[PDB]
Design a protein around this motif. Structure first.
Motif, PDB file in Angstrom:
ATOM      1  N   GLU A 123       0.824  -1.196   0.000  1.00  0.00           N
ATOM      2  CA  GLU A 123       0.000   0.000   0.000  1.00  0.00           C
ATOM      3  C   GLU A 123       0.866   1.256   0.000  1.00  0.00           C
ATOM      4  OE1 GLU A 123      -1.995  -1.896   3.333  1.00  0.00           O
ATOM      5  OE2 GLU A 123      -1.298  -0.291   4.662  1.00  0.00           O
ATOM      6  N   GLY A 124       0.396   2.308  -0.666  1.00  0.00           N
ATOM      7  CA  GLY A 124       1.164   3.541  -0.704  1.00  0.00           C
ATOM      8  C   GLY A 124       1.817   3.817  -2.042  1.00  0.00           C
ATOM      9  N   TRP A 125       2.755   4.765  -2.074  1.00  0.00           N
ATOM     10  CA  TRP A 125       3.422   5.122  -3.324  1.00  0.00           C
ATOM     11  C   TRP A 125       4.954   5.044  -3.411  1.00  0.00           C
ATOM     12  CZ3 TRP A 125       6.166   9.292  -1.755  1.00  0.00           C
ATOM     13  CH2 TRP A 125       5.618  10.102  -0.740  1.00  0.00           C
ATOM     14  N   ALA A 126       5.679   5.265  -2.321  1.00  0.00           N
ATOM     15  CA  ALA A 126       7.148   5.201  -2.381  1.00  0.00           C
ATOM     16  C   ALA A 126       7.801   6.010  -3.518  1.00  0.00           C
ATOM     17  CB  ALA A 126       7.598   3.749  -2.479  1.00  0.00           C
ATOM     18  N   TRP A 127       8.893   6.705  -3.198  1.00  0.00           N
ATOM     19  CA  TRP A 127       9.612   7.498  -4.185  1.00  0.00           C
ATOM     20  C   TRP A 127      10.427   6.577  -5.080  1.00  0.00           C
ATOM     21  CZ3 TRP A 127       8.588  12.648  -4.158  1.00  0.00           C
ATOM     22  CH2 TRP A 127       8.113  13.210  -2.960  1.00  0.00           C
ATOM     23  N   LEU A 128      10.946   7.131  -6.176  1.00  0.00           N
ATOM     24  CA  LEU A 128      11.767   6.376  -7.115  1.00  0.00           C
ATOM     25  C   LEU A 128      12.897   7.242  -7.657  1.00  0.00           C
ATOM     26  CD1 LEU A 128      11.805   5.405 -10.570  1.00  0.00           C
ATOM     27  CD2 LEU A 128      12.742   4.125  -8.650  1.00  0.00           C
ATOM     28  N   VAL A 129      14.122   6.750  -7.502  1.00  0.00           N
ATOM     29  CA  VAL A 129      15.313   7.439  -7.983  1.00  0.00           C
ATOM     30  C   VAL A 129      15.872   6.646  -9.176  1.00  0.00           C
ATOM     31  CG1 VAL A 129      17.718   7.858  -7.427  1.00  0.00           C
ATOM     32  CG2 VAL A 129      15.952   8.613  -5.861  1.00  0.00           C
ATOM     33  N   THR A 130      16.269   7.347 -10.236  1.00  0.00           N
ATOM     34  CA  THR A 130      16.780   6.678 -11.432  1.00  0.00           C
ATOM     35  C   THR A 130      18.179   7.062 -11.927  1.00  0.00           C
ATOM     36  OG1 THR A 130      15.408   8.231 -12.712  1.00  0.00           O
ATOM     37  CG2 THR A 130      14.546   5.986 -12.385  1.00  0.00           C
ATOM     38  N   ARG A 131      18.657   8.246 -11.557  1.00  0.00           N
ATOM     39  CA  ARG A 131      19.977   8.707 -11.987  1.00  0.00           C
ATOM     40  C   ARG A 131      21.130   7.967 -11.322  1.00  0.00           C
ATOM     41  NH1 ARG A 131      22.151  13.061 -13.524  1.00  0.00           N
ATOM     42  NH2 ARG A 131      21.878  13.792 -15.689  1.00  0.00           N
ATOM     43  N   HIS A 132      22.224   7.798 -12.057  1.00  0.00           N
ATOM     44  CA  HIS A 132      23.388   7.097 -11.531  1.00  0.00           C
ATOM     45  C   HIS A 132      23.901   7.700 -10.221  1.00  0.00           C
ATOM     46  CE1 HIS A 132      27.435   5.331 -11.329  1.00  0.00           C
ATOM     47  NE2 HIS A 132      26.989   4.404 -12.157  1.00  0.00           N
ATOM     48  N   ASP A 133      24.060   9.020 -10.171  1.00  0.00           N
ATOM     49  CA  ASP A 133      24.553   9.637  -8.942  1.00  0.00           C
ATOM     50  C   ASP A 133      23.570   9.538  -7.765  1.00  0.00           C
ATOM     51  OD1 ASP A 133      22.902  11.582 -10.273  1.00  0.00           O
ATOM     52  OD2 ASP A 133      23.824  13.167  -9.090  1.00  0.00           O
ATOM     53  N   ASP A 134      22.281   9.751  -8.014  1.00  0.00           N
ATOM     54  CA  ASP A 134      21.302   9.661  -6.931  1.00  0.00           C
ATOM     55  C   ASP A 134      21.128   8.232  -6.407  1.00  0.00           C
ATOM     56  OD1 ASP A 134      20.853  12.400  -7.281  1.00  0.00           O
ATOM     57  OD2 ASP A 134      19.282  12.033  -8.770  1.00  0.00           O
ATOM     58  N   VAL A 135      21.312   7.243  -7.277  1.00  0.00           N
ATOM     59  CA  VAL A 135      21.175   5.857  -6.853  1.00  0.00           C
ATOM     60  C   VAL A 135      22.337   5.496  -5.924  1.00  0.00           C
ATOM     61  CG1 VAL A 135      21.226   3.455  -7.593  1.00  0.00           C
ATOM     62  CG2 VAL A 135      19.866   5.140  -8.852  1.00  0.00           C
ATOM     63  N   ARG A 136      23.517   6.016  -6.234  1.00  0.00           N
ATOM     64  CA  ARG A 136      24.672   5.757  -5.395  1.00  0.00           C
ATOM     65  C   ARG A 136      24.474   6.442  -4.038  1.00  0.00           C
ATOM     66  NH1 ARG A 136      28.480   8.369  -7.027  1.00  0.00           N
ATOM     67  NH2 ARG A 136      27.743   9.292  -9.000  1.00  0.00           N
ATOM     68  N   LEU A 137      23.901   7.645  -4.049  1.00  0.00           N
ATOM     69  CA  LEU A 137      23.646   8.374  -2.805  1.00  0.00           C
ATOM     70  C   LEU A 137      22.692   7.602  -1.892  1.00  0.00           C
ATOM     71  CD1 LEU A 137      23.642  10.725  -0.873  1.00  0.00           C
ATOM     72  CD2 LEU A 137      21.917  11.849  -2.278  1.00  0.00           C
ATOM     73  N   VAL A 138      21.479   7.386  -2.382  1.00  0.00           N
ATOM     74  CA  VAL A 138      20.466   6.676  -1.619  1.00  0.00           C
ATOM     75  C   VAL A 138      20.913   5.329  -1.066  1.00  0.00           C
ATOM     76  CG1 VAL A 138      18.225   5.547  -1.686  1.00  0.00           C
ATOM     77  CG2 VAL A 138      18.554   7.760  -2.839  1.00  0.00           C
TER      78      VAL A 138
END
Ligand code: HEM
Ligand SMILES: O=C1C=C(O)C(=O)c2ccccc21
Ligand SMILES: O=C1C=C(O)C(=O)c2ccccc21
Length: 404
Positions: free
Chosen positions: A45-60
């Motif tokens: 249930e819910g929506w959850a965020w989504l990251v797709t960029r190479h740099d942001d994926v490494r950050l998260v």
């Protein structure tokens, strides 16, 4: 100011069976929309965020502000109708305890550690290929080799008797049986948990290089608890079979695009690099896997991920980052930096990364060097692919070769 609607709309991302190795059009869309999007998966249930960029994926994935343990406190929107790893498995542990549990088996999964099972694995692979040849051309590469091989290698590393291989596969199958909303997978999990709990206890708490012995010795000196050990032993065994599916896409593609196979046949030295390029490109799974929860507010590319919000990263989308991988959709065996994240990133990065590379290495070798004129027995599009699954891959891979 004016009228600021800077929050992306929740995009519905239903379970859809993709053909072969085609890229998910929805994911394509999510990537164009913005660095930060929101999605709604088939379950939870819910929506959850989504990251797709190479740099942001490494950050998260490598930042303490995002945790896994908290993900169990809620029914985060997801693709799978039930959490595979138990409430104590590696996937749900955070750096403090997570680092401790992973260190117990580190020695067996480094390049040098895996390199220790190279000769043994080569021989097993050769028996399977020899058996394929002896039988005759019309063969299903998946059933004849891409399936049995990875299973034999992981069981060997884990310390699982060759006579129990069928059981691992059966259980892994049921555990990942994907859907409904109950216990075929639950019972399968208890049975395998019971299996490894006993093996870890069965003197495998003495001396030996296998992973279960390492886990048993670790449990004996109070380094890790029995729960943590079984949880890890179970996910390794299961992940072990991930190679079957990935190598299946690898071969379907190599034989689908004859120019790729030919380059590997005539230029063996470049096989290592080509395999890494193939690993970057191949859409390994459907949608996304296990999310992370923001343990505190965190701003990313103008978006505020509020504490308590679930966040997903797409390694597939990251490996298709234009800025990091120019001409992203093109499979170039050269590829300069090629820092793909197919094996994950951060503390939860895949411990089987080097093993899988080794397995992929031996597979390409044996298959391209021992099967003269190996080719698909049917048109690329007539090859069936797994439906309603987490990891994408051929259901079967009909091929033929010179001999007959
Ligand atoms: C080329 C085949 C493989 C691919 C593409 C792959 C990919 C991945 C990815 C994307 C993750 C999740 C990272 C995250 O949560 O951020 C993962 C986790 C994991 N993989 Fe693999 N994997 C492969 C093979 C294997 C094998 C053969 C094993 C068994 C030795 C394995 C064991 C694991 C385990 C235990 C985890 C959980 C790690 C943790 O959360 O601490 N994987 N893998
Ligand atoms: O193959 C995998 C792909 C994932 O996205 C993934 O999350 C994962 C987790 C644990 C074992 C294997 C995998
Ligand atoms: O997609 C996956 C998600 C998991 O949570 C997971 O535990 C897993 C294990 C083995 C293959 C794939 C997956």
């Amino acid at each position: 100011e004016t009228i600021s609607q800077a929050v992306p709309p929740v995009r519905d991302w239903p379970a859809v069976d993709l053909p072969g190795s085609d890229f998910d059009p929805v994911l394509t869309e999510l990537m164009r929309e913005g660095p930060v999007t929101r999605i709604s998966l088939p379950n939870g249930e819910g929506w959850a965020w989504l990251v797709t960029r190479h740099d942001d994926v490494r950050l998260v994935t490598n930042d303490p502000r995002f945790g896994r343990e908290a993900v169990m406190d809620r029914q985060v929107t997801r693709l799978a109708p039930h959490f595979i790893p138990a409430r104590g498995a590696v996937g749900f542990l955070d750096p403090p305890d997570h680092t401790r549990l992973r260190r117990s088996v580190a020695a067996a999964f480094t390049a040098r550690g895996v390199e220790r099972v190279r000769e043994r694995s080569r021989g097993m692979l050769d028996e399977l290929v020899d058996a394929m040849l002896r039988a005759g051309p019309p063969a299903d590469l998946t059933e004849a080799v891409l399936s049995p091989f990875p299973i034999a290698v992981i069981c060997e590393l884990m310390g699982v008797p060759a006579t129990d291989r069928h059981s691992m596969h059966t259980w892994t199958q049921l555990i990942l049986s994907s859907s409904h909303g109950a216990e075929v997978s639950e019972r399968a999990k208890n049975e395998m948990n019971a299996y490894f709990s006993d093996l870890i206890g069965l003197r495998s708490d003495s001396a030996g290089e296998d992973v279960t012995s390492l886990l048993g010795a670790a449990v004996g000196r109070d380094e890790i608890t029995l729960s943590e050990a079984v949880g890890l032993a179970v996910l390794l065994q299961i992940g072990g079979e991930a190679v079957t599916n990935n190598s299946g896409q690898m071969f379907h593609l190599l034989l689908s695009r004859p120019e790729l196979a030919e380059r590997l046949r005539s230029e063996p030295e470049i096989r290592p690099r080509a395999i890494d390029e193939l690993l970057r490109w191949i859409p390994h799974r459907n949608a996304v896997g296990l999310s992370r929860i923001a343990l505190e507010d965190v701003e990313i590319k103008g978006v505020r991920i509020r504490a308590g919000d679930a966040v997903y990263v797409s390694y597939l989308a990251a490996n298709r980052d234009p800025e990091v991988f120019p001409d992203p959709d093109r499979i170039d065996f050269e590829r300069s930096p090629n820092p793909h994240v197919s094996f994950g990133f951060g503390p939860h990065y895949c411990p089987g990364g080097m093993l899988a590379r080794l397995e992929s290495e031996l597979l390409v070798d044996a298959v391209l060097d021992r099967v003269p004129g190996l080719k698909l027995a049917v048109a690329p599009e007539d090859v069936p692919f797994k439906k309603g699954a987490l990891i994408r891959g051929p259901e079967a891979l009909p091929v033929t070769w010179h001999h007959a």
